[PDB]
């Protein structure tokens, strides 16, 4: 028979599976649509979430009861030391999707960015990009060829960048390496931009301007194995419940003779990849500035 | 099958009260001679008080088209049973022989009324040769003077599965 009283289902089925994300660093699943007219620009930056604080600002909303009145607002501070450009990637579009045809790296790579490629860094010969550096050190001996390949092909160009973990006050010493898509001009112009910025450090103000509405992509806080009551927010069973109350009582009907995917079950909570949109930049503050 | 037209003459069994009965005749379109005799007795049972036991068949002779290589108009009066009732209808065919006209009439009734062989009585087939007696438009269409038409979109059946040029439907 039917449900006696209608209630909305617990949880969102579009955020499934509620498993641990593949890594700490959440990737940009999709970049802004490309427009050739706009200048070549980074579409992303990498920061380290430091903490939250409070700001007070005069709200300007013509019609709210708090128009031209002070409002207190929570804010998040992301420490964003300038990220170094090391290498670029070209993506040729195929009837199976975007495929990277080649990746050209920079002449010299930072010790943190090779620590990224290592795991037992101290017990290592640090042989990393040594033969690539030998391939380098000339005008176009083997680098102008790869750049010309990316110019002739690779309708989508992404630049490889890494964070300055040493500047950031953590204990990691292992830079975070990522790609940011260049979303302006021609493919040749994007490759020109990447070449010019090889081994150059880009600051956050160049890409993000105040009062912008940006997205944050990150892996949420992990909370380990969780019961269904907190993992899905299901109703708690009454106090006099034998064998437990932080559970879902009926996890399925007799038929189909299976537990459905849409029934709430205990497991890992948190440490999921998330992309949360429409966060307003309240300030872009400079480090070299008391 | 290939229908043939038969003349079947049969009579009642002669009795000593009065010998030599009236010796009725019929034209029957049938696959062969056994079916011709069977249909003759069917229609004679429908008409007169006689049956195969009470009568005999004195002659069966298959009749040929007088000129089986000349095109004529054939008016066919039929009666047939539907799923609801019995109806008399009149169709006409362009053909070279009455047997082929009747065969194509049988196919026609099957296709246009789902009327099977059992539920069809060919009342009459009349060979009409003059125009202005052809009443159906789907025949007067081909009695048009100096008629010529093309056959657009020729489809050529191939023997091999794979072809190495794209086809043409030109004629």
């Amino acid at each position: 028979s039917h449900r006696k009283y209608e209630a909305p289902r617990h949880g969102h089925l579009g955020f499934l599976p509620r498993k641990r994300a593949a890594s700490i660093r959440a990737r940009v699943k999709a970049f802004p649509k490309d427009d050739r007219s706009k200048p070549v620009a980074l579409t992303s930056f990498l920061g380290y979430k430091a903490g939250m604080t409070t700001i007070v600002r005069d709200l300007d909303r013509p019609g709210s009861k708090f128009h031209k009145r002070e409002v207190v607002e929570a804010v998040t501070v992301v420490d964003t030391p300038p990220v170094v450009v090391v290498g670029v990637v070209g993506y040729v579009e195929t009837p199976r999707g975007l495929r990277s045809l080649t990746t050209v790296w920079a002449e010299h790579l930072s010790d943190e960015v090779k620590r990224r490629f290592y795991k037992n860094w101290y017990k290592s010969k640090k042989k990393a990009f040594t033969k690539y550096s030998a391939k380098y050190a000339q005008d176009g001996a083997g680098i102008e060829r790869e750049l010309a390949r990316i110019k002739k092909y690779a309708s989508v160009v992404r630049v490889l960048v890494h964070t300055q973990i040493r500047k950031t006050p953590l204990a990691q010493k292992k830079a975070h390496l990522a790609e940011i898509q260049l979303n302006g001009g021609s493919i040749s112009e994007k490759v020109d931009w990447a070449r010019e910025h090889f081994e150059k450090t880009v600051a956050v103000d160049s890409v993000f301007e105040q009062n912008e509405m940006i997205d944050a992509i990150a892996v949420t806080k992990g909370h380990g194995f969780e019961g269904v009551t907190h993992r899905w927010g299901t109703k708690k069973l009454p106090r006099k419940t034998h064998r437990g109350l932080r559970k879902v009582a009926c996890i399925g009907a007799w038929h189909p003779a299976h537990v459905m995917w849409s029934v709430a079950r205990a497991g890992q909570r948190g440490y999921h990849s998330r992309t949360s949109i429409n966060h307003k930049i309240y300030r872009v503050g400079k480090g070299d500035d008391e | 099958a290939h229908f043939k037209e038969y003349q079947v003459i049969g009579r009642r069994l002669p009795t000593e009260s009065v010998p030599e009965p009236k010796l009725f005749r019929m034209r029957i379109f049938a696959s062969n001679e056994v079916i011709a005799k069977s249909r003759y007795w069917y229609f004679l049972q429908k008409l007169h008080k006689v049956k195969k036991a009470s009568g005999e068949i004195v002659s069966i002779n298959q009749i040929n088209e007088a000129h089986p290589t000349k095109v004529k108009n054939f008016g066919v009066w039929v009666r047939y049973d539907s799923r609801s009732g019995t109806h008399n209808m009149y169709k006409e065919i362009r053909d070279v022989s009455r047997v082929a006209a009747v065969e194509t009439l049988y196919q026609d009734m099957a296709a246009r009324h789902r009327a099977r062989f059992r539920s069809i009585h060919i009342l009459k087939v009349a060979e009409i040769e003059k125009t202005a007696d052809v009443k159906r438009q789907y025949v007067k269409q081909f009695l048009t003077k100096d008629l010529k038409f093309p056959l657009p979109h020729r489809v050529q059946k191939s023997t091999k599965t794979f072809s190495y040029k794209r086809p043409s439907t030109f004629y």
């Binding site: - | 438009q137 789907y138 269409q141 081909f142 048009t144 008629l147 038409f149 093309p150 657009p152």
Partner: protein, 191 residues
């Protein structure tokens, strides 16, 4: 029944030319050039004397002999739009709120904008197709004239105006407000 041959003779005015490839029809006249694809009809054409063209269907059904005369009328429409032009006159109907209709050019597009229809703050923007000219007809109050060669484009623009001036949530038998096509004629009639 499969009629063996159905043919209609279309007449070509002395001032125009018809170029009929496989099934692309191009009519050229004083007013311009009008093209139409017809690869969906499966008809045949035969030029006769530069002034008659016979459209024919061989062994066509009822639904085919219908389309034959349909394409005949369509080609006559292209010819008439290339010789005389098509003019559609629409009147404004409004009980209390005056309908205010003008032309704007956003990025060079000649949109028609309607304001104060039943006195609402919404702006009703309709685009204008290729080859369609809008004239705000003086000498008669609240008239808009849509003129061109392609009768399909002209009549479809007029239909857009009519279908953008719809009234909702009201008894449309009493709220007769709207922009209605009152005249469907030729541009150069009685030349």
């Amino acid at each position: 029944m499969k009629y063996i041959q159905t043919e209609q003779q279309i007449e070509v005015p002395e001032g125009v030319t018809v170029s009929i490839k496989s099934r692309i029809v191009k009519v050229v006249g004083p007013r311009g050039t009008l093209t139409k694809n017809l690869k969906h009809i499966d008809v045949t054409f035969t030029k006769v004397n530069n002034q008659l063209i016979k459209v024919a269907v061989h062994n066509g059904g009822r639904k085919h002999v219908a389309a034959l005369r349909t394409v005949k009328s369509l080609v006559d429409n292209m010819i008439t739009g290339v010789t005389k032009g098509y003019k559609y006159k629409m009147r404004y109907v409004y009980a209390h709120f005056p309908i205010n209709v003008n032309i704007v050019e956003k990025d060079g597009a000649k949109f028609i904008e309607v304001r104060n229809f039943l006195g609402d703050k919404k702006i009703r923007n309709v685009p204008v197709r290729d080859g369609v000219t809008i004239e705000f007809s003086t000498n008669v109050k609240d008239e808009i004239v849509l003129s061109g060669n392609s009768v399909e484009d002209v009549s479809q623009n007029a239909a857009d105006l009519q279908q953008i001036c719809r009234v909702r949530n009201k008894d449309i038998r009493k709220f007769l407000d709207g922009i209605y096509v009152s005249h469907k004629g030729f541009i150069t009639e009685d030349l």
